[PDB]
């Protein structure tokens, strides 16, 4: 199965007084496992999943050290970026960094990515090929000139093909019980009469993991899209996800309609 690890970094300047706020979140597939928040007393990379708590203090002192390195390079980054776009000193700006690697079914390296945005939009992102950078702007073009010169992309290839895969593989072994355990959806449907002549069929898929689910309705065996409301997959708050898809039906015809649930933890359901 394809697994992955991603680090989401957010930096917001606080113009009035102080440092910019920094949050770093780590995830292995749809599971959060570490966090760092600047407005937190620990001032440490803290665990957020049972299975990473096993890690000795050489890990927590080394992750804290690093996440802090990072907060500081985005503090500098927010200053640079304001010169480059020539902006005023007393507004906030967000920089956001994203990196990680996916591995495939053979547990070998599959894809790697390191992107970066400023104020909502793409700034510079490394390519799939891990050798060039896509600069979206002429400010980002300054940064691509610097990173090409400095051989930044090669420094990252080694981490995304080495350290990243290495540590994703152990997170999966130490976390076997949950990280490699798919919870197929628990489905059920409800029926709610909108009127005397129409009903809503809501097809509910609850308590599943991963979050990727396909909910599609069908009438007389052909897929139906018309008069189908559907929701964004939401987190239940316990590590699983919920989603439902509804359809309005003529009352008396609901036999025609079937919900088809698609999900990794399932041999397909109707």
């Amino acid at each position: 199965g394809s697994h992955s690890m991603r680090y989401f970094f957010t930096s917001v300047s606080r113009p009035g007084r102080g440092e910019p706020r920094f949050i770093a979140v780590g995830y292995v597939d749809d599971t959060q496992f570490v966090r760092f928040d600047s407005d937190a007393a620990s001032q440490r990379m803290e665990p957020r999943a049972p299975w990473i708590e096993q890690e000795g203090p050489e890990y927590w002192d080394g992750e804290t050290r690093k996440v802090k390195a990072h907060s500081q390079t985005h503090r500098v980054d927010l200053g640079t970026l304001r010169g480059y776009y020539n902006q005023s000193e007393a507004g906030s700006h967000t920089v956001q960094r994203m990196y990680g690697c996916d591995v495939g079914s053979d547990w070998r390296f599959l894809r790697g990515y390191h992107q970066y945005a400023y104020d909502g939009k793409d700034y510079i992102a490394l390519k799939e090929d891990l050798r060039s950078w896509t600069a979206a702007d002429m400010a980002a073009q300054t940064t691509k000139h610097k990173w090409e010169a400095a051989h930044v992309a090669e420094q990252l290839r080694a981490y995304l093909e080495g350290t990243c895969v290495e540590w994703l593989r152990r997170y999966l072994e130490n976390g076997k019980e949950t990280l490699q355990r798919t919870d197929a959806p628990k489905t059920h449907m409800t029926h709610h009469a909108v009127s005397d002549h129409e009903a809503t069929l809501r097809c509910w898929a609850l308590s599943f993991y991963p979050a990727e689910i396909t909910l599609t309705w069908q009438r007389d065996g052909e897929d139906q899209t018309q008069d189908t409301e559907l929701v964004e997959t939401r987190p239940a708050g316990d590590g699983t996800f919920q989603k439902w898809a509804a359809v309005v039906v003529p009352s008396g015809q609901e036999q025609r309609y079937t919900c088809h649930v698609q999900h990794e933890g399932l041999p397909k359901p109707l």
Partner: protein
Amino acid sequence: IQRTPKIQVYSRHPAENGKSNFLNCYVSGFHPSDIEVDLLKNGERIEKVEHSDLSFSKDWSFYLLYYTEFTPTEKDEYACRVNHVTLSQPKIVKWDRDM
């Protein structure tokens, strides 16, 4: 870029009156990150509300889950109030137990 938050109010487990449960307000699809979300029971704001660590999805927009342990009854109305820079007024979306 500034994107308006998308909001969903729901229960962790299907609700039965008198059984403790959890009330989630998932706010997603927004930028900038400063957003104020608070769960209101019968209009009164609830304290003792927890929430996840800020993350973002693929198009760089943010999302957050706020939650509280609660026990539905017939009498009590719950809601989630959200206020963000794109919003000319805060959005109060009420909990419906069929959604």
